C-alpha cells in the first residue's frame, strides 16, 4: 500500500513498545527509526544508542552520536571490544556473526538496564538473520514492508535531511580470510582509507597484502586519481607497507 | 497574493464538479492531483497515466506509485504510439500527433468517467507558443489549471512547500523518438536496442546519456565534463552495444 | 536544550515588535527570517538583501526569490564598496571597511523602516575573534538573535527541520577581493573580467573553482581531484578567458 | 619500373640505374584522385629520369561506386596507362613474394617508411566516391596527423565521421575533441565521432 | 647482443669464413639479433642455455647473475663510450639493439624458486603489456599478486586496458592484478 | 639531389679554409661533417660558445659531437649579459647578442686564418657575412635530412636549443640568480620526460609551456613539479593552457 500505511503500521508498533532503545548508527535508515520514536513516545522513552569499537571509523562514531543529538535523542555510546572474542581476532569467515553476535548481546544489556522494551534496528528491504532472531531485535523498517525509495519519501516528508550518506563496512573486510587482525594493522588501515578519503574519494578500500597495499576504487573514479598517485605512494609508504598498489578491477 | 494565486486556482475547481487529472509524477501534475482531491474529493477525480514504448516503465510505474500515495484511483493506459505513421516514421512534427493521440484517450477515458474536462499540470512557465503538447491540448480542451491560476515555477514550490508535498519524480523524461534522426522508422527492436544501451551506460555511473541511432552506428553523447572519467569503459560499452546491434560504437567529441 | 532555546528567539522577536532583517540566503538568516515572519507578522519584517561590486548578481537574484517566497517584503539595496579606499586597493584589513559600510547602509535602512533592531543571521559557531562581521556588527549595534539564544551549527540545522525548512542556498560565497593580491587595486573593469572568467568556469562543470588575477596571468584554481576532467577544456578556456583581457591562462599545479 | 617510393620499387631504380642505365630505363611516379600528393611529390623527389602521370580513377564506374573490385580495378587501370607509356618511351614492378590485373598487362615483378592506403579504404563500400567527400577525408586525415597523431582514419559515414585512433592514444586526444570536432565540421561532417574501438 | 657494441665487432671484424636464446630471456631478443648479424654478412648460429640447472639462478641468490653469467661463457668456450660511437658512424652504422633485455629473474622476489610455469606467465603477462603499446613494462610476481610497473608517464595512456589488462593476467593465474603507484625503477 | 651538394662542394673547394659556427643541430653538423670531407681536418676550425644564456649541459654535447667527428674543436665564453640590452632584455635583445655572437666568430675566424664563418641556415648574418652553404646550396628541412642519412650521420643534438632569454618578457632584468632558476626548472621537467618544456619566467609565477599532445600525460607529476619549482624561488607553479 502507499507510504501512508506502511507509516501507521510504523506508528501502531512504537505505541504498543512504549519504550524502546534503538540502535542508531546515523545512516539514512537508522535516522528515521530514531526520529519516528522520538516523534511518537518522546525523549523519556526512547535511548539511542552508538557503538564505537576497533572495526570503526571513529569518524563514524562521532558524526552519529551528534546527528542523534541533533534529533532530540538522549544518546549514549557503548564501545565493543571486539578483537577479545577469537573468531573475529582471525578474521574467520563466520566473524561478521560473532561481531555481530556481540553487538546484539551489548545492546539488549543496554535495554535491559535501560526501561526499554525491545531494541530496534534501523534495516530496511532491499547477511545473518540467525544473529537479530537471537537477542530479540526488532527491524521496524523492514517489518513495515519501506525499500530505500518509501525511506527517502518518508524521511523527506518529515525535513530529515542530515545523515551518513557514506556507508561503512567492518575494517575486518580489508583482510584476507586467516590474517590475524591486530591492533597494528588495523589502525594501519584505516589510516591509508582515511587519507584516501580525505582526497576526495568517500568510497575507497585500501585491501591489506602484508608489505603490499591493494587500493580499491570505483572504476568511474580511477582517472580522477592519479593526480594523487606520487602522494598516496609516499603517505601509504609511511604507514608501513612496502608496495602501494591500485586494483586494475576497481571496487566491487 | 501566493494566496491570491491559490484561491484562483480552488475556485475553478468547483464549478467543474468532477475531472479526471492526467498524473506525470512531476512536481507540477502532482500538485493537481492534489488540490483537485482536497476540492474536489476522492470520488470526483480520476487519476490517468500513460505507459508506451516511447516512454521506460521505470518512469510509468513510478508515477503509479506516487498516485497510490497520494491517494488517487489511478488508471493506466497504454498508447500504440507507433500505430500512427508520423510517429512511426519520425516526421519533425511528429512530437504533435504523438500528443494529440495522448489527450484523445485522455478525453475518451474522462467522458466514460463523471469527468466534465481532463486537467493537466502545465504552467505559465511552458507557456511558450513552441512548447509542443500545448497545441493539442488546446485542441482536446483539456485545461492546464495553474497557468490558468497564474503559477511561476518557483510560485509552484511555495504550494507544494505549503502543502507538505514532496515525494515527487525529479529525474526528467524525453520520448525515445529523440534519439532516432528525423526519417528513420521506428520498430519495437530498435527502438528496445536504443533503451537497452542507455540503460547499460547508466548503471556505469553516466545519468546523462544519449545513445543516438544511425542504423548500424551508435554515437554516445555524454556530458563533456565525464569524458575524461569514460575511457575506463571504452571497450566495454564498444562489445556491450555491438551486441545490442549496432556495428559502430562511437562517442560524439561534441557534448550533450 | 532546543525547546527552549526556541522561545529565547520568540521573547527577543516579541519585544522587539518590528525589525528589519539581513537575508542571504544561507540557512543561518533564513531561520531568523522565517522566524520573524512567524512570530511578528509579514507586516512588521522588512528582509533586506545587499547587492554590491564584490558579489555576483546571480548570488542577489537567488536571495530575493528565496526571500519573496518565504514570504517576506523584501527590498535590496546597493553598496558601493569601491569607494572606500580601503576595499578598493586591497589591503587586508578591506573585508572590515567593507563590512563596516555594510551595517551602516543596514541601519539607515531599519532606522527609515518601523524597525527597531537589524538582526544577521549569525550563530554561537562564529562567536570567535578572526571573524570579519563581529567587529563592525557589535559596533553598529546589529543584533545576532542566533547567537542569543545559544544557536550552534547543529541547534539551527534541528530548529529549521521542525519549521518545515528543506530550502536555502548551498552554494557559499566569498568577496570576490580574495582573487586580487594585496597591492592590486579593484577597478570595475579587473571585477567583471574576473567574476566573468568564473562563471563561465562554473558553466562548464566547475561550480568550486577560481581565478586569482595577476594582471596579465589568469591563474585557476580547480580542486584536483578535478584538474583530469578540466583537459578537455583547455582550449575553450584558454580561449574564452583572453577575450576576457587576460593574456595568459594558465592552472595552478597546486590546486584549490 | 614503376615507382612508388617504397623500398621494394627502390630497389629496382637503383640496379636498373647500375644494370641498364640512366637513358634506357624510365622512371614512371603515378600521382591520382586516391592518394595524397604529399606522397606522389616525395616519390619524384626520391627518384631524383622521372616523369610523372594522373590516372584518373573515379572515371572507372566500379571505382567511382567503391565496389570491392575497385582495389582491382584501379590495379588493372594502373598498368594499362603503364604500358601505354612505354610505347613511346621506347614495365617493372617490384612485388617481392610476401595482381590479377597485374599480369594482365604484361608487368614484370622481379623481386619511406610510413605506408599508404587507397583513400576508398575510408569508405564503406556502398559509399561512392566524390571528388569532395574524398577531399574532405584526406584533409581531416591530415588535420589530426598534424596534431601529433601519425596513425589516424576517418572513415566517412555520409553526415558521420568516424574517427579510428590507436586505443593507447585516446587518452592524449581529448585536449582536441573540440578543435577536432570543429575542424571536422567546417570539412563537411555534421557529426564527429570517435571510435570506441579501435584502430 | 646486438647493440652498438656488439655489431661494430661484427662488421669491423678477418673475413666471413653467436647469439644465445635462454628461457630467461625472450624469444624476440633471440630473433631480432639474428636476423641483425645475418644482415651485417656473417655466418650466426644460436646455442641455447638451460640456465635452471645451475642452483643459483634457480634459487634466486643475488649471487645468480654473476652464476649465471658463468653458465653462459662456459658454452662460448666450447663453440670457439663516445669513441665508439666514432668509429661506428663513419660505416654507415645501421642499427643498434638500444632497448636492453633483462633476466626475468629480476620479475621475482629474491629466493622465489623460479618455475618453469611461473616464469612463463610472467613472460606471457609482459609480452601482453608490451604488444598493447607498453615497450617499458614489468610484471613483477608476488604469488597470487601482480604487479605491473610501468613507466609514470604512461599511466594516464594506460586506463583503456584496465579491465582488459586485468582479466587477461588472471587468466594466466593471478588472483590479483595491480598497477604500482609508484611507476618503474628509474 | 646531388645538384644541391654540388654548389657544396664548389663552394667549399674554393674557400679552402673555413671556421665553422657548431651548434649541435642537425643542421650544423652536415655542414661540419662536410667541411672536413671536403677541406679536410686541417682546414676546417670548428668553434661551440659558452654563455650564461645556454645550459652547459647543451655546450659539453656540443664539443663531444665535434670531436667525435673529427674536427679540430675549439670553445669560447660570450659574456652576453654585460650588453645592457640582453640584461634589461629589450625588445632588440636577439639582435645584440646575434651581433655579438656573429662578432666573436669573425674574429676567431679572422685569428686562424679562415675564409669565412660557415653555418647551418636552411639581418644579423649579412652585417658579419657569415655563408650560410647549406641555404646557398638548395637545401630543404628534407634535404637536409637526407644527406645526413647518407652520409652515415647518426648522432645530432635532436632536443632543440633557446637562448633561455625567451623565458623572460620584455623589460624584466636578468640576474644570475635569475636564469639559474629558470636553467633549473627546466632540466627537472625534462627530467620527467618532457624534453620539450618551458619554464616561464613571471616574478612569483613559472608559467610552463607543454605540448599540448603531452599534457595529458603530465597530470601524474602536478604535485612533484609544484613542490620542485616552488623550491627554486616560484611562489605559483602553474601550466599554461595554451600549450608550446
Ligand atoms: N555503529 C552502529 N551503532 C549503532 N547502531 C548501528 C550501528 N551500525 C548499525 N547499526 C544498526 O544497523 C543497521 C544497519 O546495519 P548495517 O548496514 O550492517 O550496519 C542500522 O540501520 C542500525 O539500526
Ligand atoms: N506519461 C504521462 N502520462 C500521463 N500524463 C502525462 C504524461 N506526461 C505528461 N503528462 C502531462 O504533461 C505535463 C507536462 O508535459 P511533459 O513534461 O512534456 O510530458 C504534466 O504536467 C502532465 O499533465
Ligand atoms: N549579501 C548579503 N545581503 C544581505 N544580508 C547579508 C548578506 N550577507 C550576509 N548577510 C548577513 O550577514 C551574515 C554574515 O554573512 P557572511 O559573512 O557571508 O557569513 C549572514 O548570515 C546574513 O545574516
Given at each position: 500500500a502507499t507510504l501512508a500505511t506502511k507509516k501507521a503500521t510504523l506508528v501502531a508498533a512504537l505505541k504498543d513498545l512504549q519504550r524502546v532503545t534503538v540502535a542508531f548508527s546515523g545512516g539514512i535508515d537508522s535516522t528515521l527509526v530514531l526520529k519516528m520514536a522520538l516523534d511518537v513516545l518522546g525523549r523519556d522513552n526512547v535511548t539511542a544508542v552508538v557503538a564505537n569499537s576497533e572495526l570503526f571509523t571513529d569518524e563514524e562514531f562521532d558524526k552519529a552520536m551528534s546527528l542523534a543529538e541533533e534529533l532530540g535523542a538522549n544518546v549514549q555510546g557503548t564501545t565493543l571490544?571486539?578483537?577479545?572474542d577469537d573468531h573475529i581476532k582471525n578474521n574467520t569467515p563466520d566473524s561478521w556473526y560473532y561481531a555481530k553476535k556481540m553487538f546484539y548481546s551489548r545492546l539488549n544489556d543496554i535495554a535491559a538496564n535501560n526501561g526499554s522494551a525491545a531494541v530496534l534496528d534501523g534495516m530496511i528491504k532491499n547477511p545473518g538473520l540467525k544473529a537479530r532472531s537471537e537477542a530479540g531485535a526488532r527491524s521496524l523498517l523492514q517489518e513495515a514492508d519501506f525499500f530505500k525509495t518509501d525511506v527517502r519519501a518518508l524521511a523527506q516528508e518529515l525535513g530529515l535531511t542530515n545523515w551518513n550518506k557514506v556507508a561503512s563496512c567492518?575494517?575486518?573486510?580489508?583482510f584476507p580470510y586467516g590474517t590475524t587482525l591486530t591492533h597494528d594493522n588495523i589502525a594501519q588501515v584505516m589510516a591509508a582509507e582515511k587519507y584516501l578519503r580525505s582526497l576526495g574519494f568517500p568510497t575507497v578500500r585500501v585491501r591489506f597484502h602484508n608489505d603490499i597495499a591493494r587500493i580499491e576504487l570505483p572504476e568511474a573514479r580511477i582517472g580522477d586519481f592519479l593526480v594523487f598517485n606520487d602522494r598516496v605512494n609516499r603517505q601509504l609508504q609511511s604507514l608501513g607497507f612496502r608496495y602501494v598498489t591500485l586494483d586494475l578491477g576497481g571496487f566491487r
Open positions: 571490544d571486539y578483537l577479545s567492518s575494517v575486518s573486510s580489508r
